[PDB]
Amino acid sequence: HEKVTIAPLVLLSALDHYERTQTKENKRCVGVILGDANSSTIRVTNSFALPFEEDEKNSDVWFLDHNYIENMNEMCKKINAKEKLIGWYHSGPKLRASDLKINELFKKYTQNNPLLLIVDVKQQGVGLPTDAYVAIEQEKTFLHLPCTIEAEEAEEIGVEHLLRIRLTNQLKSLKGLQSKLKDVVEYLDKVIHTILGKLQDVFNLNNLQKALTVKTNDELMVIYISNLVRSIIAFDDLIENKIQNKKIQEQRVKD
């Protein structure tokens, strides 16, 4: 499928709009993103912040000002003519029921499929909390795409100024397992469909990995064979340094 790539300028901007706005009482901060969604890799080069207010007890009441949409368009076209509105982002990982109503507001302004961006301001997860969903025909479903970081000298350089393998992956696997454990327990309390369909396919596709263990060790010893000649070459580097240091000792005594 497609891919989502976001520069750290957009990631840091969405995370800094929570403290500046001083949003409290468990509310959300909605903002718009700019970029080019026409290619297979969506690149977000710009982001903004718009005022958003929605009632917690009533999900049928929402308000969004359209002046900021027309004001930022006239502002960007006078600066960067290659940037258009590809969608919008939210302030939290948890999805609400208003995602379908907000999608109808930008469908007239956006000339392509609206991109749903999800950014966690709390950063209570592991790895990259930022999520990217794509709304397509289901009524409507949200297809998620992997989010990456843009590699360029216009962004990552400023990151290096501010700031300055499997062990991390195993901790990420525990996060995915705990999500399925709580989903099954909470499902039984509400009773006594798409999740159960894909759950039985995981078990049948690590008890099954033991059948290939006979053929697994075939390429495992090759690593040790590659490491055997790897360690032998390491002696030629250390012994040559000993011979080099031995010649330095003779130069200091004769001096």
């Binding site: 207010e53 009632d55 049928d60 009441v61 929402w62 308000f63 969004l64 000002d65 359209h66 002046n67």
Partner: protein
């Protein structure tokens, strides 16, 4: 008289296309917004009028405060022509809209044109009227064409927000006589007793 923020709430519901005005009443409110726009813009040097459609299109906003009538009149033709009117969630949209106005010294006022009566209970309007009363928000209700087939359901909303005419709680009843549309709200105390016309 002084600077104020006017928000016009129209009705896109199914009964708004009736013949209270010649041709289609759904297209009649095009002149109603234009009449208020020309009256308020000529009274004060800086004034803006908003537009909110809460019937059948969900609580959306066609146009916010602006000084141009081009996009306001154009958005009325392509909007939703039929639906269900809900005045409980529509007035809450204009409340948060008044914070986006130009000057903070402008008087808060909401003008809503109700075509058909809502099917929702009137208990929600009791707590809604007390919310706008504490923030000193002027409420302008125009009820026309719904008085024949039903009693006014917004009378309880006005009774709780009831205030003298110098502050809030302005209730109007248009006589169903052979009178022009822009002349119905002209004789009503809306643009009367102001600085200039």
């Amino acid at each position: 008289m002084v600077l104020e923020a006017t928000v016009l709430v129209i009705d896109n519901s199914e009964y708004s296309r009736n013949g209270d005005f010649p041709r289609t009443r759904f297209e009649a409110q095009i002149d109603s917004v234009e009449f208020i726009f020309q009256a308020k813009r000529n009274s004060n040097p800086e004034n803006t009028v908003g537009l909110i459609s809460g019937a059948g299109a969900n609580p959306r906003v066609l146009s916010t405060f602006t000084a141009e009538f081009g996009k306001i009149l154009a958005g009325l033709h392509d909007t939703q022509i039929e639906g269900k009117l809900h005045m409980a969630t529509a007035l809450q949209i204009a409340q948060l809209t008044l914070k986006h106005r130009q000057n903070k010294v402008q008087h808060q006022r909401i003008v809503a044109f109700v075509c058909s009566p809502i099917s929702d209970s009137r208990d929600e309007l009791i707590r809604l009227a007390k919310t706008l009363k504490k923030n000193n928000v002027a409420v302008d209700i125009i009820n026309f064409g719904e008085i024949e087939q039903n009693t006014e359901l917004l009378d309880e909303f006005i009774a709780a927000v009831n205030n003298p005419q110098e502050e809030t709680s302005h209730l109007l009843t248009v006589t169903p006589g052979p009178r022009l549309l822009y002349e119905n709200i002209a004789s009503s105390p809306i643009i009367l007793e102001e600085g200039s016309s």
